Amino acid sequence: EEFMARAISAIAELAKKAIEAIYRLADNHTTDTFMAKAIEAIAELAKEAIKAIADLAKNHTTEEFMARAISAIAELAR
């Protein structure tokens, strides 16, 4: 259904935007502390999003879900 399908995109979307925003600030900065903050924040954002997506998709019997989760995780992870 729609909830499960949107949830994969929504889960990855929120973490992805937060990852890009904290990364971008850290990429512009030369401060080690700020880079480290983005690193830890990024791990928390992608870690939760990846686990939630992987389990959501594995509770389906179709390629729609594996496709959404493979792309969502591969993008969050990379």
Add this chain to the structure above:
Amino acid sequence: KAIDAIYRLARNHTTDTFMAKAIEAIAELAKEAIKAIADLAKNHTTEDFMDEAISAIAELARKAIEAILRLASNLTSETYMRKAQEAIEKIARTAEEAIRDLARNLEDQERRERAKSARDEIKRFAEDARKKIEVLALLKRSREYLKKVALIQLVIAFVFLILLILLSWRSEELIRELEEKGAASEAELARMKQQHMTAYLQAALTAWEIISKSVIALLLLQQNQLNLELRH
């Protein structure tokens, strides 16, 4: 239906109790189901049993294992990682064999090749979890045990030192009382002084022997820890 229902709900847990219930619930059914599905399919050559059983088991076995290992990943202490590993190994061995026999009884090489991949990831999930727990858990016990032993041995060394100072103090007190009072002749005191020094000696000689023995107990533990860490 039962594993998908359990996994769909289990993945949303926040506590150890509920994740642990899912770990057992998932393995109890996947293990019994897999064994039954194949044991029934294994008794006939029809492709209908082989295909339904190979497909049902490869999906059931992997979801049950993956669900357990993922719940375990949020519970990394031995209590839950061990329940998860045992839950996985029981499913995984049942599934490796169930898949293997059904795959070989079906003439379609495509089912056999996909089945081989499922068999290997299933076996490895159980073996991966097994090696990590057994070696790391044993290393932790060896380190804790050795530290506890070193602490016991320090207590022993300190009480030997206490005994030696007590003997020295008693020697001074016993002689001082007699010398101040004139309650013993010098010959009597000289004999007492040797008796006091002899007791000091007995204590000192033993304390040093025991410390050497204490070192050996620690080297035996260091040898044990070394061979575990080295062999992993």
Add this chain to the structure above:
Amino acid sequence: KAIDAIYRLARNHTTDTFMAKAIEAIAELAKEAIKAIADLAKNHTTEDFMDEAISAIAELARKAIEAILRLASNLTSETYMRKAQEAIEKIARTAEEAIRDLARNLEDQERRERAKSARDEIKRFAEDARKKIEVLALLKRSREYLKKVALIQLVIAFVFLILLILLSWRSEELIRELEEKGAASEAELARMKQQHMTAYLQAALTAWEIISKSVIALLLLQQNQLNLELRH
């Protein structure tokens, strides 16, 4: 007829006694029957003996093993899981060999391929049950033994501490009586004080030596448990 009759009734048991009777009843007949069916079929090349014996044994061997293991799954303590494993291994080895020899004596590769699958699941049921019981049972005994030893050793440490306090108390009492009464000279008391402290010393030095030895007995057990858990 006897195994199907036993299994049809055995699967409906609710008690340990009756499930256990079925475990033995199933193996006694499947093992004797399988050995006999093949030993007779093995003495002639006719396809009628080979087909009846390969088919009868692969079905008889597997139902007897599966029935036993499933009864055992509701009786997971060692008492019954061991009866089940032994009951299975006896059937399983008899059947692996009975199937193997009959299958190789028949020119039809299809009987040989189905027979190979039956042989492997039969062997594995016995090996799976064997490894789980032997390693887990031995780990349980090693842990229970070590805990019992630690408890014995704690009792020993406590009685050594009791002996030391008793010696200290007797020293104070023996001297106090004499000093209060004026029943001993100071020189006599000084000698007694050293004798009392010397007895204290002998007790203390030994208690510490024994505690070190107690630690070694536990490290020897920890080394044993480690190698079992590590090697599984």
